């Protein structure tokens, strides 16, 4: 669909150089143990990240744009859920969600 196309564009923007300063925490799945964090998967039921979104997109695993949005939003929600509101990673999530929500709203 033309909506899934629009979403692919958004994904590419989220991955582009412009946003790399606050998008990077979300490039790959959280490796919590590597960060010295060992309850992440007790708190977070379903991990999400942009490489996963990209894999689904590439593999045509998204039934519609709303499923795409559900994943991206979940990626942010996990971050907000697990971390305190003053966390710098939360700031990064908010800045990147700035981008996502705005471009997603421009969807035909
Ligand atoms: C998993 C551990 C919890 C957070 C943490 O305090 O890690 C030390 C963590 N912080 C970070 C984190 C903390 C501060 C800043 Cl400014 C950016 C990212 C984090 C880092 C990463 O490096 C590859 C990848 C994922 C991260 N992440 C995401 C997504 N959600 N929370 C985090």
Author numbering: 347 to 454
Excerpt from the paper describing this PDB structure:
In previous work we have explored the potential for establishing a bump-&-hole system targeting the bromodomains of the BET (bromo and extra-terminal) protein family. These four human proteins – BRD2, BRD3, BRD4 and BRDT – each contain two tandem bromodomains that bind acetylated lysine residues in histone tails, leading to the recruitment of multi-protein complexes to chromatin. Through this function the BET proteins play a significant role in controlling transcription and regulating gene expression. The phenotypes generated by said inhibitors have been used to investigate the functions of BET proteins and their significance as therapeutic targets. This process has been limited by the pan-selective nature of the BET inhibitors, as they typically target all BET bromodomains with similar potency, hence specific proteins/bromodomains cannot be associated to specific phenotypes. Through structural analysis of the bromodomain we hypothesized that a leucine/valine substitution (L/V) would be a more conservative change than the previous L/A substitution, resulting in a smaller ‘hole’ but still allowing enough space to accommodate a bumped ligand.
